[PDB]
Amino acid sequence: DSWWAKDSPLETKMAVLALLAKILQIDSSISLLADTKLDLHLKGQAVTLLPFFTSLTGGSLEELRRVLEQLIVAHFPMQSREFPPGTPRFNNYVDCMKKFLDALELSQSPMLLELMTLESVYEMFRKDDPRLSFTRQSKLNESTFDTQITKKMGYYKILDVMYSRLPKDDVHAKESKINQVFHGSCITEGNELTKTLIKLCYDAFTENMAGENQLLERRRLYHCAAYNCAISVICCVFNELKFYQGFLFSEKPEKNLLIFENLIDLKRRYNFPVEVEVPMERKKKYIEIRKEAREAANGDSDGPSYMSSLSYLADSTLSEEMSQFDFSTGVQSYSYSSQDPRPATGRFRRREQRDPTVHDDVLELEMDELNRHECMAPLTALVKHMHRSLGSVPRDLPSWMKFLHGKLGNPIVPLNIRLFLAKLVINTEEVFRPYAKHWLSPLLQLAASENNGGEGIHYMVVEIVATILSWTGLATPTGVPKDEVLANRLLNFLMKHVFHPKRAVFRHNLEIIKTLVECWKDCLSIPYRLIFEKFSGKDPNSKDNSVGIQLLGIVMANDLPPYDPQCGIQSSEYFQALVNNMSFVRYKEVYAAAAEVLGLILRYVMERKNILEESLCELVAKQLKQHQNTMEDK
Amino acid sequence: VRCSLLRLQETLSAADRCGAALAGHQLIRGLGQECVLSAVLALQTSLVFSRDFGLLVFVRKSLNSIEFRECREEILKFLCIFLEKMGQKIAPYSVEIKNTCTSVYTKDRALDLLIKLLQTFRSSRLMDEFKIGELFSKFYGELALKKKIPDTVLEKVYELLGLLGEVHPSEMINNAENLFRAFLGELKTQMTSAVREPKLPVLAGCLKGLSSLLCNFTKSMEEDPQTSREIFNFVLKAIRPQIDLKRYAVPSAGLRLFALHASQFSTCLLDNYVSLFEVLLKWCAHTNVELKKAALSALESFLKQVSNMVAKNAEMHKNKLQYFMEQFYGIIRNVDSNNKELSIAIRGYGLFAGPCKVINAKDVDFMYVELIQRCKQMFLTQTDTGDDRVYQMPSFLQSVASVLLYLDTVPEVYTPVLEHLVVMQIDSFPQYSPKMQLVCCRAIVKVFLALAAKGPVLRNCISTVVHQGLIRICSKPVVLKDYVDLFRHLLSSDQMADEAFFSVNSSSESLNHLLYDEFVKSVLKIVEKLDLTLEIQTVGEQENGDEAPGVTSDPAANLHPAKPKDFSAFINLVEFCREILPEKQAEFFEPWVYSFSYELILQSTRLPLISGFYKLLSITVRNAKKIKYDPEKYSCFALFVKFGKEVAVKMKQYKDELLASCLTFLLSLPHNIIELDVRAYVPALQMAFKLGLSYTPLAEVGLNALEEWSIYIDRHVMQPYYKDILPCLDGYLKTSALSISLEEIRIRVVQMLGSLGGQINKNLLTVTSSDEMMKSYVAWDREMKPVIFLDVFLPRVTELALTASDRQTKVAACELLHSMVMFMLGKATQMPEGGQGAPPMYQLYKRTFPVLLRLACDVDQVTRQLYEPLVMQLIHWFTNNKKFESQDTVALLEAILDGIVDPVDSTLRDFCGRCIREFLKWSIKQITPQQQEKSPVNTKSLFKRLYSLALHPNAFKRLGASLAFNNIYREFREEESLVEQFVFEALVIYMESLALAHADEKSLGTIQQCCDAIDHLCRIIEKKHVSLNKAKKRRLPRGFPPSASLCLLDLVKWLLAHCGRPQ
């Protein structure tokens, strides 16, 4: 503490005497080498100059900012590395650095596409004053651009709020793989400062970056991106939002004449606030909407309660898409303020579903739905506040759900994934009707409009019928009055589509069907005489016989004889023809599995009354007698 | 056994011998996949082979060519890849394989059979390297010739001649030469009109052949510039065919062995072909086509030849040199725009090969300022994870040396740049392949080789920081991805050098400043910082009194342990060259002396590292008997014995298990030099290696110290020492021998007993009188009667001392002894008078049992927890309701303050926690207030037994005990009514009596500190009072400065300025 402050003012009363001698060292524009040294010193000084008076440049240390400039302008290499320091945080400076730091990112930091491919540790610091990092280290032009950003971002956010305008220009224009580096470096820095005002300055700053100015389109898209992350992870003790949204409250009523970009700009800057509303809400909404009462109530009425329907001419393609995105979180402000939620209790208006018809039509987008969407989360979010207000047969009749249903149109595709998280905590007794109702709908389902099939839709509608399984109340009350075309077209489609599992190399085909029939024993075994009439016993002159074996069997003999040999060979003697191919063998392995099942089939059939099957067993023995020839070793 | 091949073959071959019409081709493809799949490999190999010759040779050789070719087509393809896969040791098998392939070529007399015969020719050069090779090579020569019918066979003979050159046969010195003179004649007559392109055989064959041969033919004769420029140049122009990018790797691998032959024609015509030779190289690094490693080898080789031709020129010419290397400069500046990524190597070591001729026309240091700056960017960014692993990084660093060396002037400030380029490339060594590591050894010398010509100041700072960067990265060292094995590369590095001599010196400077990081000093108070933070208001006074005799910056104590281990395997064995003794001898003895005695265990072990090592100390011993009856080695022979005297005595006793573990292997090498004096004074040493006998066969530890002592002091002319020596020595060594393996311990125990011819009887004699025999117990103190209380007692004893073999022995055994002691009460429960043998033979029976619970605390942890609650669940019962019999519990506890006999520094204290506790439930046993004065067995008798034990026999080791014990119960003695008043006179008698008792220890037997942790515990006591005792106890010590005796008064003097205060 004694030697720290005794060297600097003499390194400053000679910083006039000796840098006026480094004059031709400084601006050799021969002192090309010498000058790159003079930076290091300034760095080595600025480090021992961090505590107390020498840190401030205003006052007793005079203008040394004179000397930072002369180096950003001369040349470009090794300048990257004499740079992340500095950190002077005052006005007037602002005109200098911005004017010069910008004219430098024009030939140093490009908008272009990714043109790329304790003790003892002291000596680690003694070997750390001669430039570089000795500990922090344990194509070519692309990865040093990534390193400058490192140097740009390590210190970065801590020095000044103003510093942040300039990294924003880089988040825009084009994407690049710094995306993760940011989310790692920008989250850990909004929370690192942990001093107010500073905090709200960054806020009040970027809020005005969304103030009036003549930008383009992408500059405000990736804005939201680098926006939400600056905001949705941050500290507390806030009123910045009551008065700025006290201004943005007056920014609620907005109207746009038809224009190429007029509708978008108005509704761009209109998605932003409701977007900053809800992460500023939830965490700080219960106290602030309870103190505001009616004003907070009036925005939750003006804001939501609106469905965009009957509109035409643009309006939908890019805006209704972002209009719904904050419609449900605009409802999250009311979920952050509900005792028995009235907008939840029921729906407002009449009309078609808000979601786009094309997305359902796309199918692929539907898959994204599986991935999930911002719109999807609030419904999921409601579950959080609905099981805290949820409460035998009298307990199953009431719990919303009947409000929602499924309907008889087309875009039921939504309501489904919504139920995929819903049966997470909507299963069994709480609700009886929804489980039964869902089954009647995956009739043609997603895989009939999709002949190729999908790992997205199957697994789901597969697993949806895995939780209706095991449910007592869901297996039989849709098994007696109406497991008809419901259950019939189910089993019929199952077998009719479980084709080509051979191209798939997936045993999954079996368990999936086996686990199914296991428990839906009830309903007439329409598969019994129809899988037999499917036969599949194509001649073995090909590997097609392999595609019929497990089918003929693995299904059968499960707990109770299913159908048994008797109900198959009753509607048609196609078991006589299933015997004519068992004798025929081409494939080296799995051929017996055939005879294997006949064994188990003949065992539990003579256990049953049998008698009528006994004449058959003689023909079977006559087969193994018709054999022995050709070798008899296999 | 039967195996799967002897049966599968004689069945499906004796059946394919009569019916292979399509019924064999599918069968042998199957049986073929079987033999390909692979005890199982070796037996399948040896038997299939001996049967392949005995079954599928003379059977498949007959029949039809078509029927047996599809057989042989598949058989040759799986046998060949198996010959490469099968291990060696098949030399006679091969000789038969030979006679077989010449028979398959005989059946070949057919395109699928020729290529599978090609498959027999690769696995022909597998072993080779024997005179047996040439005895058949000579006769395979002729069949190689005789091209005869126009077939694709030019590839073969030039390939077989290559199988010769790969076998390298001296006997193929006549036939082989007359062959290539015709292959030459063959390829030259081909090109013009027949076919625009040579066929597959004329390409891969005569090229792969004209490559592997040329090891003898010299000079050019114009033969090379005509052959190579027409043909090789053209295999270096094709891009479009797929496998052509593998027909491009063999011609360039041709030019690399052509190096010397490529030099005799390129030196003529490769100048105006500066475009030719450079296009093919750059053009090569285009597509990583199976032959990325063929881009590097073709280039990096042909560039070491460029470097040759640069020095293989005068100063003349020069124009073509400057032109190319400034093109090389062009590569350096356009990489900024577009990254060469790997062509960064082509200019990196492209700065390596020809760095020197140019600097005589123009000063070209500057490439260096840049390339440094260039590699300063390969490693500064290394603060990022885009650079996965340090590939190739010593290869540019090879060029570093290559150009640092030549320059005459010294550069500037960029000096620290190639510096942190060293430390990291010294860290780039461990992560590697074996081949990769060797080149790096070479790279280090160049940096050292040039750096040593200009300014040595620098490679010093290397090493202190480069080791430190190795203890700490080895933090969490692998003594339970980097460790000390790497610097076991330095010896290779040491092997070449003046620098190596300097390097050895550097290591001494290294740690001889690295532990002085206070780094040892800090974890010492961690010992005392771990008991002082466990402090509240009731537990803090007990953490203070209970303390074991003798033994924060955890990254330092931990850092320190790695270095001794790191050095021991390193130095010691490399030849000193006499260099070590001057620095190692007296001067080194000196840092060791200055740095030793702090109390750290590892460092002491370290001193012994050069202790055995000096090659010729026969000066240090022979000139030491002449100084007692050159000055430097004497003055260390001082610190030795002087250092030696202050070793075991000051640390064999306050030693504990671990720093005696670690403090009597030191002590087993001090006799070496000073042998005649160390026998008189320290004989006890190998004797005291009784505890180091059963935990040594895990690491040949303390028992290795019994064998090298005798054997070296046998080689000692002093005969009249045995009488002092050999009685009490082997008076125990005999029983470390009732059984480097534990019985090879006994092997050399034989060679030593007997080597003295009539000197072993003098052992088991005093083995049997000093040890004392089996003590025994005396007078042996509802269907079946079992009592037998003695016969069952002794063995439970006999088990809990050893406690070994998983303690699965020990576990149920003491657990058995537990329910056993409960039974000792059972008869002393009725109302009889007999069986009164239960008391005084429980005296013998109450053994120093707590030594079970305490050494259970170290290893058992559960056993102690069974056994701590017992000894306190037992103090109260005898004490509360019984008298006349407790004494014995005092007897052996008071004998645990004897336990300092065996300096088991854990047991001493391990009991003291019972003194307080016995007296504790006495404090709740205020019982007999009228009978405390009527019946005498209480506090009066207590503190009589206590103080009289502090001062017993001139404080004969029975003291020091009485320091910890008083401290343990100081907390409770505090609270006492008017009782601690008339007994507070002995408090200061204690005070005065206690200090004097030891001021004539004279030996830092480690008590001096316990005694002061006692006096201030007597100064709190004051509390004003009426002070009728005061008038004395300030007269009394006023007259005690005179007793002096050394350390007394020095503390008593504070006591009287203190007492001269309240009154």
Contacts of A133 in chain B (CB under 8 A): 380, 383
Contacts of A35 in chain B (CB under 8 A): none
Of A33, A119, A137, the CB nearest to B522: A119
Distance CA B390, CA A138 (A): 11
Length of chain A: 634
- Residue B543 and residue B1013 in contact, taking contact as beta carbons nearer than 8 Å: no
C-beta atoms of A119 and B518 within 8 A: yes
Nearest-Cα distance to chain B for A501, in Å, is 27
C-beta atoms of A132 and B341 within 8 A: no
Of B387, B419, B556, the CB nearest to A119: B556
Of A119, A124, A143, the CB nearest to B384: A143
Which residue is closest to B471 within chain A, CA to CA?
A120
> Cβ contacts of residue B869 below 8 Å, gap of 6+?
none
With DSSP H G I counted as helix, E B as strand and the rest as coil, what are the percentages for chain A, rounded to 5? 55, 0, 45
Q: DSSP class of residue B924?
A: S
Nearest-Cα distance to chain B for A474, in Å, is 53
C-beta atoms of B383 and A119 within 8 A: no
Nearest-Cα distance to chain A for B99, in Å, is 37
Q: DSSP class of residue A8?
A: T
Contacts of B338 in chain A (CB under 8 A): 141
Q: What is the dotted CATH code of the domain comprising B3-465?
A: 1.25.10.10
Of B335, B373, B420, the CB nearest to A132: B420
Determine phi and psi for B526, rounding to 5 degrees: -55, -40
> Cβ contacts of residue A334 below 8 Å, gap of 6+?
A300, A304, A341, A343, A344
Q: Dihedral angle at the C-alpha atoms of A52, A54, A59, A61, nearest 10 degrees?
A: 170
Helices A526-534 + A564-571 axis angle, to 10: 70
Q: DSSP class of residue B859?
A: I
Contacts of B340 in chain A (CB under 8 A): 140
Of A119, A141, A144, the CB nearest to B517: A119
> Cβ contacts of residue B84 below 8 Å, gap of 6+?
B122, B123, B126
Q: Dihedral angle at the C-alpha atoms of B985, B988, B990, B992, nearest 10 degrees?
A: -140
Nearest-Cα distance to chain B for A100, in Å, is 23
Top residue of A39, A75, A123 to mutate, by most chain B CBs within 10 Å, is A123
Top residue of B381, B382, B425 to mutate, by most chain A CBs within 10 Å, is B381
Closest CA to A63 of A5, A6, A7, A12: A12
> By a Cβ cutoff of 8 Å, what residues of chain A touch chain B?
33, 37, 77-78, 81, 117-124, 126-127, 130-134, 136-144, 146-147, 150
Distance CA A92, CA A98 (A): 10
Helices A178-190 + A140-153 axis angle, to 10: 10
Residue whose structure tokens are 């020729």: B114
Residue B452 corresponds to which amino acid? A
Distance CA B915, CA B542 (A): 12
Distance CA B48, CA B359 (A): 67
Closest CA to B365 of B449, B305, B454: B454
Of B339, B424, B468, the CB nearest to A123: B468
Mapped onto helix, strand or coil, the DSSP state of residue B368 is helix
Helices A262-280 + A240-250 axis angle, to 10: 150
Which residue is closest to A178 within chain B, CA to CA?
B386
Contacts of A81 in chain B (CB under 8 A): 380
Contacts of A142 in chain B (CB under 8 A): 339
Find the angle CA(A320)-CA(A322)-CA(A323) to the nearest 5 degrees.
Answer: 55
C-beta atoms of A140 and B344 within 8 A: yes
Which alpha helices (H) appear in A508-632, and where do they start and end? 508-519, 526-534, 546-549, 551-554, 564-571, 574-582, 591-607, 614-625
Q: Which residues pair with A558 in a beta bridge?
A: A560
Closest CA to B506 of B597, B455, B571: B571
Exposed, middle or buried by CB within 10 Å (0-12, 13-18, 19+), for B779?
exposed
Determine phi and psi for A558, rounding to 5 degrees: -135, 110
Determine phi and psi for A560, rounding to 5 degrees: -100, 145
C-beta atoms of A33 and B473 within 8 A: no
Nearest-Cα distance to chain A for B527, in Å, is 17
Which residue is closest to A36 within chain B, CA to CA?
B413
Q: Tell me the three-class secondary structure of B870-886, residue by residue.
A: HHHHHHHHHHHHCCCCC
Tokens describing residue A466: 């895995």
Q: Dihedral angle at the C-alpha atoms of A542, A543, A544, A546, nearest 10 degrees?
A: 140
Closest CA to B180 of B160, B194, B195, B150: B160
Instruction: Please give the resolution of this entry in Å, rounded to 1 decimal.
Output: 4.4
Closest CA to A513 of A500, A526, A497: A497
- Method for this entry: cryo-EM
> Euclidean distance between the first and final Cα of chain B, in Å?
104
Output the CA–CA distances (angstroms, integers) from residue B376 to A154, B372, B392, B396, B416, in the order listed.
20, 6, 15, 12, 10
Top residue of A80, A117, A137 to mutate, by most chain B CBs within 10 Å, is A137
C-beta atoms of B339 and A126 within 8 A: no
Nearest-Cα distance to chain B for A118, in Å, is 7
Distance CA A373, CA A417 (A): 11
Distance CA B546, CA B968 (A): 6
Distance CA A442, CA A468 (A): 12
Q: Which residues pair with A560 in a beta bridge?
A: A558
Q: Which residues pair with A366 in a beta bridge?
A: none
C-beta atoms of A130 and B419 within 8 A: yes
Which residue is closest to A139 within chain B, CA to CA?
B339
> Cβ contacts of residue B895 below 8 Å, gap of 6+?
B848
C-beta atoms of B423 and A127 within 8 A: yes
Nearest-Cα distance to chain B for A20, in Å, is 22
Query: Largest Cα–Cα distance in chain B?
Result: 138
C-beta atoms of B383 and A134 within 8 A: no
C-beta atoms of B468 and A120 within 8 A: yes
Tokens describing residue A81: 């590395």
Mapped onto helix, strand or coil, the DSSP state of residue B74 is helix
> Cβ contacts of residue B956 below 8 Å, gap of 6+?
none
Distance CA A358, CA A373 (A): 16
Of B339, B376, B383, the CB nearest to A133: B383
Output the CA–CA distances (angstroms, integers) from residue B1017 to A267, B51, B1060, in the order listed.
82, 95, 18
C-beta atoms of B461 and A127 within 8 A: yes
Closest CA to B986 of B934, B937, B947: B947
- Residue B664 and residue B648 in contact, taking contact as beta carbons nearer than 8 Å: yes
Contacts of A32 in chain B (CB under 8 A): none
Distance CA B544, CA B1020 (A): 16
Beta-carbon contacts below 8 Å between A and B: 97
C-beta atoms of B383 and A120 within 8 A: no
> What b/e readout covers B584-602, taking b as 16+ CB neighbours within 10 angstroms?
bbbebbebbbebbeeebbb
C-beta atoms of B465 and A126 within 8 A: yes
Contacts of B419 in chain A (CB under 8 A): 130
- Residue A308 and residue A323 in contact, taking contact as beta carbons nearer than 8 Å: yes
Nearest-Cα distance to chain A for B324, in Å, is 24
Exposed, middle or buried by CB within 10 Å (0-12, 13-18, 19+), for B727?
middle
Contacts of B471 in chain A (CB under 8 A): 120
